[PDB]
Amino acid sequence: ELLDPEQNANFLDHYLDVPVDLSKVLFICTANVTDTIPEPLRDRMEMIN
Amino acid sequence: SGVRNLQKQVEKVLRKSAYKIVSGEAESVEVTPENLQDFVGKPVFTVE
What we know:
It is classed as motor protein. This is part of a larger assembly, with two copies of chain A. With about 50 residues, chain A is largely without helices or strands.
């Protein structure tokens, strides 16, 4: 829900119900090896080395 | 079997085109297969 390109724009979480709008955020993620990450998450993002 | 994976690829190509427009050189990117390897890199699978 964070990483969905469209659904990040209306993210909401149980604590504070109100939707947030993350669309402008430039997320970054760091993983030591690309193979262990589950396929649905791994398939979106580019894997620079 | 799903179409999700192709959906990631075409996303990537488009967003690189967006970078080529707003700041890059071309005002109209024109992907061609010879061009393609730039955008989406070199082929991974072939020898099914």
